[PDB]
Every structure is written in C-alpha cells, then in structure tokens.
Design an enzyme around this catalytic site. Sequence first.
Site, mmCIF file in Angstrom:
data_model
loop_
_atom_site.group_PDB
_atom_site.id
_atom_site.type_symbol
_atom_site.label_atom_id
_atom_site.label_comp_id
_atom_site.label_asym_id
_atom_site.label_seq_id
_atom_site.Cartn_x
_atom_site.Cartn_y
_atom_site.Cartn_z
ATOM 1 N N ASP A 292 10.588 -65.285 6.378
ATOM 2 C CA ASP A 292 10.231 -64.225 5.437
ATOM 3 C C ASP A 292 11.485 -63.466 5.021
ATOM 4 O O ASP A 292 11.940 -62.574 5.746
ATOM 5 C CB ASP A 292 9.256 -63.276 6.122
ATOM 6 C CG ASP A 292 8.796 -62.158 5.227
ATOM 7 O OD1 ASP A 292 9.123 -62.199 4.028
ATOM 8 O OD2 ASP A 292 8.104 -61.242 5.737
ATOM 9 N N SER B 12 16.622 -60.319 -12.750
ATOM 10 C CA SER B 12 16.445 -61.446 -13.653
ATOM 11 C C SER B 12 16.752 -60.998 -15.078
ATOM 12 O O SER B 12 16.539 -59.841 -15.456
ATOM 13 C CB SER B 12 15.009 -61.963 -13.557
ATOM 14 O OG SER B 12 14.732 -62.934 -14.551
HETATM 15 C C1 LIG Z 1 13.358 -47.803 9.798
HETATM 16 N N1 LIG Z 1 13.731 -48.560 8.610
HETATM 17 C C2 LIG Z 1 14.419 -47.692 7.660
HETATM 18 C C3 LIG Z 1 12.559 -49.169 7.986
HETATM 19 C C4 LIG Z 1 11.935 -50.251 8.840
HETATM 20 N N2 LIG Z 1 11.248 -51.253 8.034
HETATM 21 C C5 LIG Z 1 10.554 -50.956 6.933
HETATM 22 O O1 LIG Z 1 10.472 -49.821 6.464
HETATM 23 C C6 LIG Z 1 9.845 -52.101 6.314
HETATM 24 C C7 LIG Z 1 8.999 -52.080 5.195
HETATM 25 C C8 LIG Z 1 8.594 -53.377 5.023
HETATM 26 N N3 LIG Z 1 9.183 -54.096 6.002
HETATM 27 N N4 LIG Z 1 9.969 -53.341 6.818
HETATM 28 C C9 LIG Z 1 8.978 -55.527 6.195
HETATM 29 C C10 LIG Z 1 7.661 -55.938 5.583
HETATM 30 N N5 LIG Z 1 7.573 -55.457 4.203
HETATM 31 C C11 LIG Z 1 7.649 -56.348 3.162
HETATM 32 C C12 LIG Z 1 7.703 -55.908 1.839
HETATM 33 C C13 LIG Z 1 7.787 -56.905 0.887
HETATM 34 N N6 LIG Z 1 7.812 -58.213 1.173
HETATM 35 C C14 LIG Z 1 7.755 -58.531 2.482
HETATM 36 N N7 LIG Z 1 7.787 -59.833 2.802
HETATM 37 N N8 LIG Z 1 7.674 -57.646 3.500
HETATM 38 C C15 LIG Z 1 7.677 -54.014 3.991
#
Ligand SMILES: CN(C)CCNC(=O)c1cc2n(n1)CCN(c1ccnc(N)n1)C2
Length: 330
Positions: free
Chosen positions: A35, A199
């Site tokens: 992913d 794009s």
């Molecule tokens: C502490 N830190 C700053 C943030 C930690 N991670 C996130 O906030 C975050 C948000 C997403 N993901 N991780 C992973 C899966 N997502 C998505 C969104 C779109 N596509 C896919 N495949 N996954 C959305």
Amino acid sequence: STGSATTTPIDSLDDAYITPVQIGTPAQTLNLDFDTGSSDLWVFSSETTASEVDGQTIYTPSKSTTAKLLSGATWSISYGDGSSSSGDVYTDTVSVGGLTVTGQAVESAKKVSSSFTEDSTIDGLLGLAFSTLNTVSPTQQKTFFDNAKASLDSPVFTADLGYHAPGTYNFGFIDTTAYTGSITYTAVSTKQGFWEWTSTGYAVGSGTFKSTSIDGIADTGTTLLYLPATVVSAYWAQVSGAKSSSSVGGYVFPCSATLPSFTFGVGSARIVIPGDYIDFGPISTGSSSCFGGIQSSAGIGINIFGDVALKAAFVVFNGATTPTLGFASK
Ligand SMILES: CN(C)CCNC(=O)c1cc2n(n1)CCN(c1ccnc(N)n1)C2
C-alpha cells in the site's frame, strides 16, 4: 541488494493485490496488500480477536525466535474507506522477494474492522508511503522500504500491477524489459506523507487531451481512480446509460456497455487506461448494472491514482533524497 516478488489479484475483478512476505524465524509467509498510500506493516496474528479472524493466515510471534516485543508500543490506523485496525508491535526479520530487513516493526493486530475480517485473502498490509505517516506510538517506526533503502542497489521500488493477471514489485532496481518507451519522471510532494504528484491532464477515449493540473496520490492500496467531479462527469457522459447512483455510492453503467479508454498525462507523456480496466462488474450478484472504476473524489478531499490507473503503467517510486515518481507505458 535487490528484491523481486510477484503480486496477484485477490479476485476476478482485481479488487486488490497480494504479495507474499516472509516474517520471522523460521519464516511465516503471509500475503500482504502492498500500500503506497499508508506507512504501517500490520498483520493478522495470534493476538487478533478470534471472532475477527475468518480464513487469514496469522503471524504468531511466540513461534519466531527473532521476534521481540517493542515495549510500550501500540498502533491504530483508519483508512479513507472507513476500515481500521490496531494492536501492539514486535520487531522481527521481514523478507520480500529475497530482500531482507532485520529489526522491522511488525504491527500485530489485536482488533480489525469487519471489512478486513471479510477479506480472507489479505493477511495484512505493507505500507510504502513515507514514514511520517506511521502510526506507532509513542515511537514512530520506519517502513520496510525506508529500512531497506541504504542497502538497495538504488533507492527505488517499482510497481507493475497486472490486469486480470499477476504482476511484480521490485526493490532496488528498474527492470528495463518491463516497460515500453521511456520512463517519464515527475515531481513529488511529501508534505502529506504520500507519493503526491500533479498529472498534466486527461482525455476520454479518442477525444481531445485536456491540459489541466490534477494533484493526486499514487496509491496501490486504493482499487479505483478517484478524480475531480468535472473529469468524472466527462468520462461517464461517453457511456450510454451511465449515471451517478446515490444509493449505490457512485457511477454505475449498463453491463452491456463497451467502455472508452481514459488517458492521463505525466508531463508530456500519456498513460492510456483501456476501457475494460474501468469495469468493476455487477453492483450485486446477478445485476445488469455494473460499478465504474473511475469515481468522483469530491467526498474524499484528495484525488487518488489507485490501481485502475497504476496497473496501466510501470511505476517507479524513487526514494532518493528528493523523491520523484516515474511512469512508463507497458
Ligand atoms: C502521526 N502522523 C502525523 C500521522 C499518522 N498517520 C496518519 O495520519 C495516516 C492517515 C492515513 N494513513 N496514515 C494511512 C492510511 N490512509 C490512507 C489514505 C489514502 N490512501 C491510503 N492507502 N491510506 C490515511
């Protein structure tokens, strides 16, 4: 070093792709969803609530002589599609296609949401976005790619997803036999933690190319192509009988239709998605209404170049000091 692993569609519609991954000593092979839109390597495990496991292969850390519990560490993730999972964290040896990382954070699920339980073919996820998105607390962990990068012959991985067929993820090298023509590289912003790029426009079928900037993410973990409502309306207007269905949750079209192709721009280059790639089959078993593979991003807040787009190309995820993306036809 390098690695090379085959990735296989989970079903006849290419709803997702699984890639075998060896975890632990002796190896426990799990089939993970690679992913590029997330940054956690998480697995169904011996710790997952029993009623939430339905046919998946599980990781059992107690049977791995190299597994170590990461003291105090937990994780919890929600994906844009409403699904979620959470648990604790081990470090262990992880190998993909012959490429080995020691000390990789392996996030063991204690809880998963119903959509994961109901996907018996997917044993977990392997995140390939930037490590700033990793959810482990209180100490954020690195992705498999970030841990491997210094050892790789070149700091890159490539995605070559198949249409109704197996494909390949390569780490550390670019297989120049796997594409036609040249690879066109384009700038990436890492500010949201994604492989985010712009794009240069689109065309529908044999129509004129429309030059217009479309910012979005290269996301192997999203099945469909999510684009602005104007673009999506222009595509489906070329399919007799297609309509946006609020009850179904997107554009649907008569299963008897032959779909037009969709072209997207990468710099001056063009990637052509054949019409058949945009057919996701009957909305429910036996229906003659079919679900479209190009959908509006209006609800989402970001455009997503998911598998529908990426499978039409050979895609280079260049993790050099300044990351870039490359696209070639194939
Ligand atoms: C502490 N830190 C700053 C943030 C930690 N991670 C996130 O906030 C975050 C948000 C997403 N993901 N991780 C992973 C899966 N997502 C998505 C969104 C779109 N596509 C896919 N495949 N996954 C959305």
